[PDB]
């Protein structure tokens, strides 16, 4: 219903754009892994990013980050107590392994559809 | 053992008996179908004048098939023949015998199960079935397919038929085998699938009635133009025989309604 005056509809986009300003991405400070080189390596801060996604996430944090025969979960701090198959100082590991398998972050950030490249009840019986 | 409602056999009948003592004049035998009704076999009815040695021809406890040709309703006198017996009833009575042994076992099972006996099992099952539709051995395989009406339509006393049907269906599923042929059906008609379903039904119609052995048949589709035929019964000949009679009828009735059906040449 507008010609060149369609700018005010385009302004509707750059006005609903601050309705979607800084969402999809990383903010205040990502990797909480510290520099440890003992037998293998154990993070002093793994029992705080656990609830800074959702819940316990034993079938998530420790579940996904584990190579071969990796013993030990998180009762104290960190994991991989022996033989993690991941003995290093790679401060950047908790970023790529959770680049799809987040919990809850798909491809919009606000509010979307929460879990929706990795499923299981999408093939067994069509729910939708 | 096998019991009998008729203590004395009919004349000309073909039975089965187990040798008990081949002593003097001929050989003394016992008909295992009448509970052990002591019969008798004159030596003159064994073989020929082929230098006879009844000592070995008839051995202790060797079950054989004879034919009653002498019956006196006083004491016994049940003279029977051996080779003068129709030697095509050789396969006849031998086959029925297999089914009679089957009936005995299944009878013994059901009977020993509850508070019954071989005396009562025959006295209430085989007896009453004999008075309904011929021999029970064949009327039982008829019941397992029709239901529990068959046995109450004989006189069987109430709710111990089920143990019989549960135990009889056991033995049949044990001896399970399948004969399956392959066909291809491709008809183009106003209602093709309606004809395909209609013609298969015309062929299959009244096949389990003539061919008595099978339990179930399945002409399901495997591909799109090709369909499978399955016959499952308790008889080698019956299966492969019925299977072909089906397929032959499929082709024959097919062209009658313009339905191209051919047996896969693989």
């Amino acid at each position: 219903s507008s010609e060149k005056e369609y700018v005010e509809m385009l302004d509707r986009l750059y006005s609903k754009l601050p309705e979607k300003g800084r969402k999809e991405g990383t903010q205040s400070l990502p990797n909480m892994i510290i520099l440890n080189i003992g037998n293998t390596t154990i993070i002093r801060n793994f029992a705080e990013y656990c609830d800074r996604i959702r819940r316990e996430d034993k079938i998530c944090m420790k579940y996904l980050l584990k190579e071969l025969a990796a013993p030990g979960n998180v009762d104290d701090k960190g994991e991989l107590v022996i033989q993690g198959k991941f003995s290093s100082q790679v401060i950047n590991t908790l970023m790529e392994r959770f680049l799809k398998a987040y919990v809850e972050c798909s491809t919009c950030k606000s509010l979307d559809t929460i879990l929706k490249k990795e499923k299981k009840s999408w093939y067994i019986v069509c729910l939708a | 053992m096998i019991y009998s409602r008729s203590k004395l056999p009919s004349e000309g009948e073909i039975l089965i008996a187990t040798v008990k003592q081949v002593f003097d004049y001929g050989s003394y035998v016992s008909l295992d179908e009448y509970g052990g009704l002591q019969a008798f076999l004159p030596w003159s009815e064994v073989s020929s004048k082929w230098v006879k040695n009844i000592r070995d021809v008839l051995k202790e406890n060797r079950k054989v098939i004879v034919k009653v040709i002498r019956v006196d309703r006083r004491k016994g006198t049940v003279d029977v023949s051996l080779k003068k017996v129709t030697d095509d009833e050789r396969r006849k009575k031998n086959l029925q015998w297999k089914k009679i042994q089957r009936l005995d076992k299944i009878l013994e099972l059901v009977s020993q199960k509850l508070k019954l006996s071989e005396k009562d099992a025959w006295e209430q099952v085989a007896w009453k079935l004999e008075a309904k539709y011929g021999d029970p051995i064949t009327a039982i395989e008829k019941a397992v397919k029709e239901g529990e009406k068959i046995l109450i339509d004989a006189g069987v006393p109430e709710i111990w038929v089920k143990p019989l049907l549960e135990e009889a269906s056991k033995h049949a599923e044990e001896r399970k085998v399948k004969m399956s042929g392959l066909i291809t059906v491709r008809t183009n008609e106003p209602l093709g699938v309606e004809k395909i379903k209609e013609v298969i039904s015309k062929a299959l119609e009244n096949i389990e009635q003539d061919y008595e052995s099978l339990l179930n048949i399945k002409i399901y589709t495997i591909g799109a133009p090709r369909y499978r035929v399955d016959v499952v019964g308790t008889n080698p000949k019956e299966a492969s025989e019925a299977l072909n009679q089906i397929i032959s009828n499929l082709i024959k009735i097919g062209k009658e309604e313009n339905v191209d059906i051919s047996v896969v040449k693989k």
Partner: protein, 414 residues
């Protein structure tokens, strides 16, 4: 809530930006035209991007926000229930090798068009500029050019990004065609595009008193391996009814039909059958009208459809009076340079006794040329294509139905 109706409008999705055109569909409808739950739901019904959604309006509210798709007035922000307008459907047109070869079926398969823009590039594309005029060739005057992928841009990327289009429009037919800025990923300002479809792409007149004619683009065997003979279903012929009125339990016929060798001469004889069921997407109806991809169960031997066999042909009614013709008279057309991935001036002319692919509806008939005039061409078709009443826009080519080798078009003088 709203009535359960069938799609009454077909919208064409024409773009070049990867997934840009695709996501825009899920932004309205919500149906994934990438990894489908359509093959995992029935059998193997998968060709083009087929999406469908209802369109209502939350009246007593401002815009562009009243126009909603689901019965939930959560877009306009209210606990109300809108009025129902219509159910519309879209065609992504991914297919197989097709990057334009789809739009040659007619007009009732695509009653409207939405030209989705690319994204960073100046304006045209190897596809955008290609099949742009392909809308002014097959018969689509109602178009909506959308400015998608403006997810990360600026106002200045519209002071000339929009004025560049007004140049490309000024020089042909589509002048005052609307240009709506929409968010690709985010479902924002989509309300505007929806309101746009509701204004510039209205529901064309449907004459439901004419000879029923569905263009078959698919056909297959719905029965699973192992199905008993008692539970066998007829063949499935999912097409696009372009006119008329089809109902359940109706007698029809498949033209041209089958080949029949009959003492020296061969011909194509119809396939008479009955309509068993109608299925628009996933809901079972009792009658189908133009617009919307409909799946029709029949009483045919599955050996006729199964492997997409009955593809290409069209379907009418048993009583039809429809000429299925071998030879045809075609008024060819002079197209410019054509193959955007090589790029020339003119093109190889149309000589006699030459083999060309005549895309009649969805048929790939190879007809050797026999006569050549100025505006007429007699053809020696391999398969006898069927014509109902009007001349067909068969986009002639050479090989098969694909982007490789395209040349001219023209109607079918009958």
């Amino acid at each position: 809530a709203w009535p359960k109706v069938q799609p009454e409008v077909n919208i064409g999705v024409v773009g070049h930006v990867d997934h840009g055109k695709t996501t825009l569909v899920q932004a309205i409808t919500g149906i994934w035209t990438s990894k489908h739950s359509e093959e995992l739901k029935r059998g193997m019904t998968i060709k083009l991007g087929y999406a469908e959604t209802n369109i209502g309006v939350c009246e007593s509210c401002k815009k562009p926000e009243a126009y909603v798709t689901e019965p939930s007035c959560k877009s306009c922000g209210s606990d109300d229930e809108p009025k129902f307008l219509r159910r519309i459907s879209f065609i992504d047109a991914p297919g197989h090798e097709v990057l334009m070869a789809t739009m040659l079926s007619g007009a009732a398969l695509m009653d409207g068009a939405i030209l989705v823009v690319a994204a960073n590039e100046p304006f045209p594309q190897p596809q955008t500029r290609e099949h742009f005029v392909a809308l002014g060739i097959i018969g689509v005057k109602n178009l909506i050019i959308v400015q998608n992928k403006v997810d990360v841009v600026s106002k200045e990327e519209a002071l000339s990004q929009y004025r560049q289009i007004k140049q490309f429009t000024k020089g042909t037919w589509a002048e005052n065609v609307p240009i709506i800025p929409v968010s690709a990923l985010h479902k924002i300002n989509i309300d505007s595009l929806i309101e746009g479809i509701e204004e510039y792409i209205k529901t064309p007149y449907r004459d439901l008193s004419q000879k029923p004619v569905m263009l078959v683009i698919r056909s297959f065997d719905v029965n699973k391996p192992g199905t008993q003979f008692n539970e066998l279903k007829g063949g499935v012929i999912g097409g696009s009814i372009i006119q008329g009125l089809f109902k359940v339990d109706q007698e029809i016929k498949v033209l041209p039909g089958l080949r029949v060798e009959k003492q020296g001469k061969v011909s194509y004889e119809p396939i008479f059958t009955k309509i068993s069921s109608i299925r628009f997407g996933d809901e079972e109806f009792k009658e189908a009208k133009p617009g919307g991809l409909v799946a029709i169960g029949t009483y045919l031997d599955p050996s006729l459809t199964k492997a997409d066999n009955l593809l290409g042909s069209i379907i009418t009614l048993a009583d039809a009076e429809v000429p299925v013709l071998w030879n045809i008279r075609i008024k060819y057309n002079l197209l410019e340079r054509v193959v955007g991935a090589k790029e020339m001036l003119k093109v190889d002319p149309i000589r006699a006794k030459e083999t060309l692919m005549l895309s009649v509806g969805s048929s790939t008939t190879l007809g050797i040329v026999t006569s050549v005039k100025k505006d007429e061409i007699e053809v020696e078709l391999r398969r006898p294509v069927a014509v109902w009443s009007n001349n067909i826009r068969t986009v002639i080519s050479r090989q098969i139905a694909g982007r490789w080798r395209m040349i001219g078009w023209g109607l079918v003088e009958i």
